[PDB]
Design an enzyme around this catalytic site. Structure first.
Site, short mmCIF file in Angstrom:
data_model
loop_
_atom_site.label_atom_id
_atom_site.label_comp_id
_atom_site.label_asym_id
_atom_site.label_seq_id
_atom_site.Cartn_x
_atom_site.Cartn_y
_atom_site.Cartn_z
N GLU A 192 0.83 -1.20 0.00
CA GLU A 192 0.00 0.00 0.00
C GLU A 192 0.87 1.26 0.00
OE1 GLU A 192 0.17 -1.32 4.44
OE2 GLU A 192 0.35 -2.15 2.48
N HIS B 2 15.99 -37.65 26.21
CA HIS B 2 15.04 -36.98 25.33
C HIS B 2 13.66 -36.93 25.97
CE1 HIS B 2 17.15 -36.38 21.37
NE2 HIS B 2 18.09 -36.92 22.17
N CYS C 286 15.96 -46.56 15.01
CA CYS C 286 15.21 -45.93 13.94
C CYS C 286 14.67 -44.61 14.48
CB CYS C 286 13.99 -46.72 13.49
SG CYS C 286 14.13 -48.52 13.64
N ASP D 28 19.87 -20.01 0.53
CA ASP D 28 19.92 -18.82 -0.31
C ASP D 28 20.42 -17.58 0.44
OD1 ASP D 28 19.03 -20.24 -2.58
OD2 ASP D 28 17.00 -20.08 -1.82
N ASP E 276 10.24 -15.67 -2.04
CA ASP E 276 10.53 -15.77 -0.62
C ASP E 276 10.82 -14.41 0.00
OD1 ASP E 276 10.52 -18.55 -0.85
OD2 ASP E 276 12.66 -18.68 -0.95
N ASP F 225 10.88 -36.87 24.39
CA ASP F 225 9.95 -37.76 23.72
C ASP F 225 10.04 -39.21 24.23
OD1 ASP F 225 12.23 -38.54 22.37
OD2 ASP F 225 11.58 -37.73 20.40
N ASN G 90 15.29 -16.24 4.30
CA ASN G 90 15.34 -16.93 3.01
C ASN G 90 16.26 -18.13 3.19
OD1 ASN G 90 14.75 -17.44 0.25
ND2 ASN G 90 16.23 -15.91 -0.50
N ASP H 218 13.23 -17.31 -6.33
CA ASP H 218 13.74 -16.82 -5.06
C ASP H 218 13.01 -15.55 -4.60
OD1 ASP H 218 15.03 -17.11 -2.86
OD2 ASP H 218 17.04 -16.49 -3.49
N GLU I 156 9.59 -30.87 22.39
CA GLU I 156 8.21 -31.20 22.12
C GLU I 156 7.41 -29.90 22.12
OE1 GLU I 156 6.55 -34.31 21.09
OE2 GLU I 156 5.70 -34.44 23.13
N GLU J 32 14.35 -30.98 14.25
CA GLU J 32 12.95 -30.67 14.51
C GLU J 32 12.31 -29.97 13.31
OE1 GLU J 32 11.34 -32.09 17.36
OE2 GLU J 32 10.12 -31.75 15.52
N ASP K 169 16.18 -37.20 16.43
CA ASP K 169 17.00 -36.83 17.57
C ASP K 169 17.98 -35.70 17.23
OD1 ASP K 169 15.69 -38.92 18.93
OD2 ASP K 169 17.56 -39.96 19.49
#
Ligand SMILES: CNC(=O)[C@H]1CCCN1Cc1ccc2nc(-c3cccc(Oc4ccc(Cl)cc4)c3)n([C@@H](CC(=O)Nc3cc(NS(C)(=O)=O)ccc3C)c3ccccc3Br)c2c1
Ligand SMILES: CNC(=O)[C@H]1CCCN1Cc1ccc2nc(-c3cccc(Oc4ccc(Cl)cc4)c3)n([C@@H](CC(=O)Nc3cc(NS(C)(=O)=O)ccc3C)c3ccccc3Br)c2c1
Ligand SMILES: [Ca+2]
Ligand SMILES: [Ca+2]
Ligand SMILES: [Ca+2]
Ligand SMILES: [Ca+2]
Ligand SMILES: [Ca+2]
Ligand SMILES: [Ca+2]
Ligand SMILES: [Ca+2]
Ligand SMILES: [Ca+2]
Lengths: 633, 633
Positions: free
Chosen positions: A129, A437, A613, A164, A178, A439, A152, A175, A378, A340, A337
């Site tokens: 605006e 951890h 795993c 970037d 972004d 979790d 970015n 690009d 978490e 995130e 682990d």
């Protein structure tokens, strides 16, 4: 903005007039000695008032009224439209002595009016605006205003080893999506009058937080090692389009706010500074990293495991097939682990972003001694705590030292997440656990058909109660770890577990650790006992006095709406079912949660407290916009 | 605060209960296998409710009601008074199997209730109230709460080379009056039960911001190199009195907020951490440095000069005698140009404090590449600017670079004063001047009998107008610098000044510098032209293109309510009066300001742009309390 522009003794003064300002003009100082009165003339697009002792009178273009010369009689000069090539904007003052009515001297002010405005999308609707009045501040909330910038941190070009914002280059037009638009809008004649130039600038502190880009290519004009840029004026009504990128998330010592300035400078002489006769400023806030709780819809499930963990892959594939998620496999537990998953958002723009405690980096997927870690987090669903709403939930940080003092400590993750502000983080004690951890001892799950959610807690006291019941029922010789041939020689039974007095004491201590955490969760998330379900867990104390899982921690589950992927516990078999599986189904299934036990350990023939795993889930963002929050000050 | 305390399978659990908490108690886990129901008994000072699925029922001390054992049937345990030596606070749970009505097992909870509260004066009235609910936060304004700490930056012992907070020692009882009281209030039995201790602690970051002190001497328990202190419990109803001192003013990277914590710790085993079962926190805000504007009442006038500057001393002594101020003399201009006078305040406590850009330090008088300096400051009277009130005024910082970017810059004073918050500072451009000080071009004076104030600005255009008038009136051969024999050979007249074309151009540029500053002052202080008086000034450009005073800068005056000590300008004599003196009297005297010209230069026989004396005034503080402000966030 009132600006001082004095006439000059018997002479002509040329000035640029910037729209949205006005001038107060001394006429007394330019008067010849002896002069007693003055008159004035002005062109049509200049408003002139005579102001005596604060009392203003509008004056005609072409009258002959005279006023006594006085220090406290001045002019006020206003314009509302930009000058063109045909403009003759001027005020001229005639001075008279006592006797004659012919002027003894004249002083002139010749004006070029321009519009200059550095514009951003402060009303947050995705279009830039014109001159938002609030563009130089940033306020939170539904009625808040202030432009938003993304870091970015994704990657448009797999050629590049880095994300970037790590360079001062833009390779792809993609690009620019972004980046945030910033437009310098001007209106005025073909050229600026002699002796003026327009500059854009940033602080040294902001130079590692932003980059600004302007043939038809991408020139880096401000940012790392570039604090000042001379702008090329285009006459008439012009727009100069800039792209701004963020380089840095908010952190300890960086609020997230950055500023960009434009100034119109007047040349005075060589060896003398230019005079900044007009300045305009815009503010950006860099969008925070936001973590996604388990109540948000799953899009993609990322799994890491060894290639021959066939049951794990089979059962995870199967679980994901009951959903509309996609499965991505990488061939121990780094996807959970080390890493995130979260996101960043600006108006009509946003993408997922991974935080790493030292890959997925591509287009629309970004990347980023401590007592905490980005892989030890978490996040709650949205909560209201003693009247205060937390619409994006609150992050739980697992810590080796969640207290406020008493020792030297670095808490890099706490500092980073606190700086993000919008998920007001809470520290928990996780270092009583071998793996360390959060979790491994807590999860959140939706209550299907609501609305609501539950906290799931590991519980040693729930395990002991279950095993004591089974022993009482005559199943004390029930064998654990069936189908794990590497455990068979230990011949671990319920009776063997319950006879071990040291193990009882260890697990009583671990239950104290769980309950200490439980109490923080209830207070900081606004939970009652009605919101919590306890899942049976059992640990063995290691030589560092930490808790090693005795059997797989079922609380460390994959949550895909109503579908739960729960680690298979390999508990004592009673009537050829795992009593732990049956117990957990009995807790969760009445709520409409669907349990699938996933065997991650059979391929290794034994369990020694580690699973090999990891899983992580990319989820859809909250519909609530972070900038509508009002965080604590 | 709800706290988890589980019964232990068939056993007794001993716990401390901290008043203002309550317990939720698992009875299901401690139940023998097979048990179907439980009953309970409790002592008189323990309230017990049975809670099923969130529905609580209060239970008698000594009934025989039975409830089905269920995971979701728990106890809620509340106490409101501290245990004594005679207390037997207990809950006991009996368990029953299906058949018999004799208990098969019992589990007990034995409770010691204590009160523990770390208290501060958060309601800001100077007495330490009991457990202010808001003591762990700090809020601004008339309805704000939060305890206040002074920087202990004065000196109780002239033996010491440094100010008091520079050590970890308190020598004098008088020192404790600069400190804030913090009281740990406890109530309970003669001793804590076995296995508990109370600790006080701070963060490493706060350890260079605070010191905490507890025979009948002064022991340093927290602060530099002391983050953790074990507290000795006194039984019954006890108060442990601590004194807290601030060591550091708010600055860049320090908000001014510090925290102190107490925790009750439970011993678990050797080699295992203690469990923090209760924590309480208090917050202090360190009081900011506040500068005193010229409208505040003068107490003491400090002057530095050479011993034989007799006219200066005579005329200053005389000026001060027209007031009730005291005069302090030190035998160039360090008292003005190195040093600024301000104050600090807490409830019923405060003293003057000097800021030095590298003496007066004693009792109740404290001490503390850059583009700014503590000796280059001014402060406005209270102003209201576009609706926003600034009740302590705003500080003006003279800067060589008052812009927001475009070059690397360190602004140590801007950062420091911004951190103080309460006088929202504004940068001005002062480096166009040889000496480089804002007090050489601006001052503030009260309008006597009001209420209101004026800004006084140096003005070259006012000087030129005056000299041109005098020349027109036939006084062009009027001689400047009369009585300065070292100037006589230059034979400087009005005609000589006005003929010098280069000087005209230089002073036109300097007027641009003044007007640029004028425009910032008007905008940032909410001033109109009606609030400003222009005093004649004249400069000569030096070889660095800076302005050297041609004659003494009259604006750089001593303001003692209605009495003004103005530097004697040594202007052209017309009818045996200085025309500059007569002009300035004509401007100021109609407002009821009383002008005394003070000759600081006669002793040197000449003027070369420097004055060799300084003055500073210690003034009474604002009556408005800083903590009643609401600063911008
Ligand atoms: C010197 N470096 C550069 O200009 C640029 C170019 C490469 C990168 N540099 C960034 C750079 C580096 C150092 C600078 N120092 C200043 C400055 C100095 C004093 C006051 C001052 O503010 C005021 C001046 C007057 C008033 Cl009333 C109130 C305030 C600014 N500026 C100025 C620009 C400037 O005056 N340049 C310059 C040019 C000639 N020479 S000339 C007159 O022939 O152009 C001779 C001397 C100087 C100092 C600036 C910066 C940001 C925004 C607006 C400005 Br107005 C610097 C810029
Ligand atoms: C070790 N140093 C010292 O104690 C003091 C003494 C000089 C200066 N030191 C300051 C100092 C230095 C390092 C510390 N680390 C901790 C700590 C560690 C883990 C968790 C933890 O918080 C929780 C523990 C449990 C739960 Cl559920 C949740 C949180 C705290 N603390 C503790 C005190 C402590 O547990 N000491 C200790 C004693 C023995 N030995 S023992 C049991 O025989 O006393 C063996 C091991 C340890 C670690 C602490 C600090 C502040 C406020 C409350 C506390 Br509870 C330290 C204190
Ligand atoms: Ca918009
Ligand atoms: Ca780039
Ligand atoms: Ca990109
Ligand atoms: Ca992109
Ligand atoms: Ca009080
Ligand atoms: Ca001391
Ligand atoms: Ca002291
Ligand atoms: Ca003192």
């Amino acid at each position: 903005r009132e600006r001082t522009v004095r006439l000059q003794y018997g002479s002509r003064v040329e000035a640029v007039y910037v729209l949205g300002t006005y001038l107060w003009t001394d006429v007394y100082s330019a008067a010849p000695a002896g002069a007693q009165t003055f008159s004035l003339k002005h062109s049509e697009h200049v408003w002139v008032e005579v102001v005596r002792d604060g009392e203003a009178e509008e004056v005609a273009t072409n009258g002959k009224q005279r006023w006594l010369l006085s220090p406290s009689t001045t002019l006020r000069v206003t314009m509302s439209q930009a000058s063109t090539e045909a403009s003759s904007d001027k005020v001229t003052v005639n001075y008279y002595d006592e006797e004659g009515s012919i002027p003894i001297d004249q002083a002139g002010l010749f004006l070029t009016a321009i519009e200059i405005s550095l514009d951003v999308d402060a009303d947050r609707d995705g279009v830039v605006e014109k001159n938002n009045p609030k563009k130089a501040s940033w306020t939170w909330g539904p009625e808040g205003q202030g432009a938003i910038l993304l870091v970015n941190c994704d990657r448009e070009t797999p050629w590049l080893p880095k994300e970037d914002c790590r360079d001062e280059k833009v390779y792809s037009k993609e690009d620019l999506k972004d980046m945030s638009q910033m437009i310098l809008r001007t209106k005025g004649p073909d050229r600026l009058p002699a002796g003026y130039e327009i500059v854009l600038y940033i602080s040294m502190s902001d130079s590692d937080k932003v980059g600004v880009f302007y043939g038809q290519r991408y020139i880096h004009i401000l940012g790392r090692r570039k604090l000042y840029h001379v702008v090329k004026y285009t006459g008439g009504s012009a727009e100069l389009l800039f792209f701004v990128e963020g380089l840095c998330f908010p952190d300890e010592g960086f609020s997230g706010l950055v500023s960009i300035h434009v100034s119109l400078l007047e040349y005075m002489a060589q060896d003398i500074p230019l005079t900044p006769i007009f300045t305009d400023t815009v503010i950006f806030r860099i969008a925070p990293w936001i973590m996604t709780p388990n109540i948000l819809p799953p899009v993609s499930v990322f799994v890491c495991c060894m290639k021959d963990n066939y049951l794990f892959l089979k059962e995870v594939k199967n679980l994901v097939e009951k959903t509309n998620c996609e499965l991505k496999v990488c061939f121990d537990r780094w996807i959970q682990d080390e890493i995130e998953f979260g996101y960043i958002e600006a108006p009509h723009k946003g993408f997922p972003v991974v935080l790493d405690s030292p890959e997925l980096l591509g287009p629309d997927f970004g990347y980023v001694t401590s007592l905490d870690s980005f892989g030890n987090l978490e996040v709650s669903p949205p909560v209201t705590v003693n009247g205060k709403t937390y619409p994006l939930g609150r992050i739980l940080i697992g810590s080796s030292f969640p207290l406020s003092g008493g020792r030297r400590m670095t808490k890099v993750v706490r500092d980073f997440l606190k700086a993000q502000q919008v998920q007001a983080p809470v520290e928990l004690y996780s270092d009583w656990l071998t793996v360390g951890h959060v979790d491994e001892f807590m999860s959140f799950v939706p209550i299907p058909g609501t609305k609501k959610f539950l906290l799931l807690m590991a519980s040693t006291s729930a395990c002991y109660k279950l095993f004591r019941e089974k022993q009482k029922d005559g199943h004390g010789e029930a064998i654990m770890f069936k189908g794990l041939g590497g455990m068979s020689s230990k011949r671990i039974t319920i009776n063997k577990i319950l006879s071990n007095e040291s193990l009882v004491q260890e697990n009583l201590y671990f239950q104290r650790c769980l309950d200490w955490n439980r109490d923080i969760l209830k207070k900081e998330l606004g939970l009652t006992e009605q919101d919590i379900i306890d899942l049976p867990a059992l640990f063995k104390m290691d030589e560092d006095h930490r808790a090693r899982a005795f059997f797989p921690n079922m609380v460390n589950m994959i949550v895909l709406d109503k579908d739960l992927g729960i680690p298979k516990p390999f508990g004592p078999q009673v009537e050829e079912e795992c009593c732990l599986e049956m117990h957990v189904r009995g807790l969760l299934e009445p709520l409409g949660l669907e349990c699938t036990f996933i065997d991650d350990i059979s391929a290794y023939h034994k369990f020694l407290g580690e699973v090999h795993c990891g899983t992580n889930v990319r989820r859809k963002p909250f519909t609530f916009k972070w900038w509508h929050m009002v965080p604590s000050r």
